[PDB]
Symmetry: D2
């Protein structure tokens, strides 16, 4: 699988468990087409979103539902969600890990792109 | 004004200068309507995006055009942009820290 | 002055207020000699740590007392402090963003 | 092993490979005693630093040699290194992952403490 998503919690120092993640791909008319979704495991990781076959070059949006994560913990968050938007490229390395570190009023996201 | 945007370059340790920023507000038909736009100054700050009268309650999206920033500096980054989405109901400062394959964003909300 | 320290609270989305900061400078016998100290104001800023005359070349350590900050707010954090170590040879702004189990730190260096 | 260290590179979007990591523990006289060391693998991770037997409660410093990492890539860095200082606690969870995301003038560090 060429796309993995991992989410961590900076308040409790733990994986962010059961976080909904929605992936979209930009359609030719510039709207966002649903592409894949899931929820992070107990390790904070979401595997198996897609296959090499279906992960063609294009612009993708990964939406991490941070607001519902914080509310389910009883914590008031700022953002509606975390959005990661990128163009995949076949010339570059094969595997994309999208990682997000969450705080209630802040988040960081990084791409680890490897083979 | 009630909404300010600050952008820093983590590779250079400098303000991110000339960064375009587009603000959208979700419309009654839940599409993104253009709201305001501008670009950061030499301090990395974007002031005067809006007014207290116009910054009404709603769901806002601050799009920071990071890809155009890095490309103007001769670099091919990972992200298309950095999108900060929040509901407003007060001064908001939206801060972002940029690296070619990473960004961090924080909200500082005061009165 | 040539050295300023800014601290933000990522849980609250606010300046980190009353944060103690101790600056050290490596001595000729490579131990850490105390250099200056202070604490952040209501803006989360610490101005006036030193002067251009006293901020000579050297290896500096800015210790931000994050543990005491979180504990004063009733919270048990992970880190003892946040230590920023750098060589100087110009205004340095040392910025830190704090969560109970995480911190980020950036250097903004200008003239 | 109760202590793992992982390092990522935010400029290239990759693991930070071959980064020297030194761990110290505070001695009774308040000096830092060498405790363990290694270099990150090709996955950016450093396993096997210590055992449960030797990782007693105490104050530990993890020093990540970021400056040598950036210089070996030909990139001018700001910090001498990244320091993570914490008190381990036996009552809390069993495993400590110390993770650091590196940029030349910035770094982030987080603790993932699990079982
Ligand atoms: O920007 C981010 O998402 C980020 C991520 C990490 C991180 C990455 C991978 C991992 F297994 C653990 C981490 F803490 C550490 C710091 C950080 O800022
Ligand atoms: O999330 C962010 O936007 C962020 C911002 C800063 C930062 C903000 C303002 C400033 F003058 C200097 C900084 F390093 C530092 C770290 C960081 O993560
Ligand atoms: O590394 C940091 O210290 C850092 C700092 C900021 C930040 C700095 C200054 C400010 F006025 C607001 C901020 F969110 C935002 C993100 C960040 O990582």
């Amino acid at each position: 699988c060429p796309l993995m998503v991992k989410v961590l919690d900076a308040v409790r120092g733990s994986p962010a468990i059961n976080v909904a993640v929605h992936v979209f791909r930009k359609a030719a008319d510039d709207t966002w087409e649903p592409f894949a979704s899931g929820k992070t495991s107990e390790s904070g990781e979401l595997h198996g979103l897609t296959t090499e076959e279906e992960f063609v070059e294009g612009i993708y949006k990964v939406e991490i539902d941070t607001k519902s994560y914080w509310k389910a913990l009883g914590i008031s968050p700022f953002h509606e969600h975390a959005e990661v938007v990128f163009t995949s490229n076949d010339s570059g390395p094969r595997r994309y890990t999208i990682a997000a570190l969450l705080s209630p009023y802040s988040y960081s996201t990084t791409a680890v792109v490897t083979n």
